[PDB]
């Protein structure tokens, strides 16, 4: 009774869920918006022993043609989640509830992928997204990565800094900005805190940030980000589309297939030599900010890939 | 310095770690024990951008021949103070350890149950994967909808319900539960329902595409070895190959008609309490598969 050939997994309040919904409408399809944050209270899910046996709020969704996975909202600290109240009051019960929800919703996504749904970014990619594994995999497939050290050992850090020179530190997984490794950070009272959690240290690449969008083994666009160091009081960011060689294009496509994504925003960064190193592949990349600042279209090509799947 | 050809991930105070360590010891191999509980505060791990730049406590461990992954804390105060910061820090630690295991597996290490298998272990998907592949499974219903339960009971007859996650006793669904007030508590508490199988439980151990033994179960439980069919032995090897486990303890349960259904595969099944009460040898063949991968 409702068209589920294209499913968008995310909150309707998410701006990229909104963007893809508007694009899909403008192209004649209506997406089924699957909002996991309504699961227990305002939703109904039912799974049978057979893979095709999936029932959401009554209706059977055995196999969408394609799926856009914005988020399953698996932990209370996920992006579109507002869980600080429940976590403050009883963090154990809240974390358990989130884990239970995550199990079922993932089972749904993995079932769709098993029936043949083209899930734009399967959750199965997370194993390869693991950053200290991701960069090694990429490098061993022939993609340049920064000199890196993921560690909790202050000596390894001191020796790595001595081998490389100027360094940055950033999270192993995410959740903080990249900083420069200043001299204070190598002092004992600072560097000793690595005993709490490991940190990622890297050669300070001095060239420019580029964002390369890849959809279905085609580069949609490469956007270069430059920092306005002109006025020290209000530094802005300037994003502009650029041309890249076929070499860079094919390396980005190989990277996407290697990690295992269908829609990715590669973050790359150039060295002083002017050559790019791979910083990361994003499994749920955003595009609206870059779409606006660079005056390019990413939502369109994504919607067109999703629609192309329904004819496939 | 230490022999890194065979690695045992987990605390040395874990009883199965002790079993496997002594079992390897009595066979001629001293396993390196990767006590991950000492990771952040009392142990050093370092990863470089090259896959083989893996350094544990100063010593490089590039590619073990085999790894027995057993397991991978007190944070109540931290969680009450700032739960976002604490969750993120735990994610940092766990990401580094997962990256170690993944680099090893990609290098060629035979990891006995790789963490990648977790996606297939997802229960509401694991059972469907086993079903659509021709293996016998109980009729099931994961739900939070009272009507779906009322229809599932009316269809399969007597049924039981277990939790979505696990860690609670399987309970028989009676008609008292299906009444309005009683069942309405389900719309916020999803559970699994399954046709009640009246036959006996069997745990089948598979190690490298071979069934090691089968044990029937019935603080006083009786566990004794069973001879199961070559048909069922092949089915078990196939289920383990499909979920992606080099070593598993499969919980299966027979029905009234004498046909076993697969209940679950365990990604790190315990074997101490079984081997003892049944006078069978699980730790042995496991240590043997481990040492085999060294050749």
């Amino acid at each position: 009774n409702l068209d589920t050939s294209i499913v968008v997994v995310g909150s309707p309040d998410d701006l990229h869920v909104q963007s893809v919904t508007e694009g899909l409408r403008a192209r004649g399809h209506e997406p089924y918006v699957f909002d996991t944050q309504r699961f227990p209270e305002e939703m109904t899910v039912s799974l049978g022993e057979q893979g095709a046996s999936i029932f959401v709020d009554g209706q059977q969704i055995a196999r969408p043609a394609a799926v856009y996975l914005r988020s399953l909202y698996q932990s209370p600290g996920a992006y579109g989640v507002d869980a600080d109240k429940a976590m403050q009051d009883n963090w154990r019960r809240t974390l358990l509830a989130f884990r239970e929800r995550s199990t079922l919703m993932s089972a749904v996504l993995l079932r769709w992928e098993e029936a043949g749904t083209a899930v734009y970014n399967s959750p199965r990619a997370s194993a390869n997204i693991t950053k200290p594994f991701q960069l090694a995999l990429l490098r061993d497939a022939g993609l340049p990565v920064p000199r890196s050290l993921w560690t909790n050992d202050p000596e390894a850090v001191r020796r790595f800094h001595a081998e490389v020179g100027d360094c940055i530190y950033k999270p192993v997984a995410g959740g903080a900005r990249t900083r420069k490794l200043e001299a204070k950070d190598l002092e004992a009272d600072r560097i000793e805190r690595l005993s709490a959690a490991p940190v990622c240290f890297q050669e300070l690449l001095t060239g420019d940030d580029v964002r390369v969008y890849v959809i279905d083994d085609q580069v949609i666009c490469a956007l270069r980000i430059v920092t306005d160091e002109i006025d020290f009081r209000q530094a802005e960011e300037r994003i502009e589309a650029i041309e890249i060689s076929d070499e860079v294009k094919d390396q980005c496509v190989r990277a996407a297939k290697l990690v295992g994504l269908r829609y990715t925003g590669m973050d790359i960064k150039a060295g002083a030599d002017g050559n790019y190193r791979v910083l990361e592949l994003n499994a749920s990349a955003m595009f609206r900010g870059f779409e606006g600042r660079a005056n390019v279209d990413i939502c369109g090509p994504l919607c067109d890939a999703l629609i192309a799947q329904t004819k496939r | 310095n230490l022999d890194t050809s065979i690695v045992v991930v987990g605390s040395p105070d874990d009883l199965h770690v002790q079993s496997v360590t002594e079992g390897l010891r009595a066979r001629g191999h001293e396993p390196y024990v990767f006590d991950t509980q000492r990771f952040p505060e009392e142990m050093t791990v370092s990863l470089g951008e090259q896959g083989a730049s893996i350094f544990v406590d100063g010593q490089q461990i590039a590619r073990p021949a085999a790894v027995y992954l057993r397991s991978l804390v007190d944070a109540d105060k931290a969680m009450q103070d700032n739960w976002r910061r604490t969750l993120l820090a735990f994610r940092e630690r766990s990401t580094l350890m997962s990256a170690v295991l993944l680099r090893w597996e990609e290098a060629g290490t035979a990891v006995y149950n790789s963490p990648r298998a977790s996606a297939n272990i997802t229960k509401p998907f694991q059972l469907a994967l086993l079903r659509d592949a021709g293996l016998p499974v109980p009729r099931s219903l994961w739900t939070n909808d009272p009507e779906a339960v009322r229809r599932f009971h009316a269809e399969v007859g007597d049924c039981i319900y277990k939790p979505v996650a696990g860690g609670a006793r399987t309970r028989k669904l009676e008609a008292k539960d299906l009444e309005a007030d009683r069942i309405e508590r389900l719309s916020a508490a999803p559970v699994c329902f399954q046709e009640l199988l009246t036959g006996d439980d069997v745990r089948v151990y598979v190690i490298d595409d071979q069934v090691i033994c089968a044990l029937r179960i019935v603080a006083e439980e009786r566990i004794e070895a069973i001879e199961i069919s070559d048909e069922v032995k092949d089915q078990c090897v196939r289920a383990a190959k499909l979920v992606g486990l080099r070593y598993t303890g499969m919980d299966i349960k027979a029905g009234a008609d004498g046909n076993y259904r697969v209940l679950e595969l365990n990604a790190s099944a315990m074997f101490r309490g079984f081997e003892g009460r049944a006078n069978v040898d699980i730790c042995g063949p496991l240590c043997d598969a481990l040492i085999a991968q060294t050749k």
Partner: peptide
């Protein structure tokens, strides 16, 4: 924490 500003929203599945 070595990364002081960690917790202080740059959340998980943002990107």
């Amino acid at each position: 924490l070595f990364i002081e500003d960690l917790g202080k929203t740059l959340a998980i599945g943002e990107e």
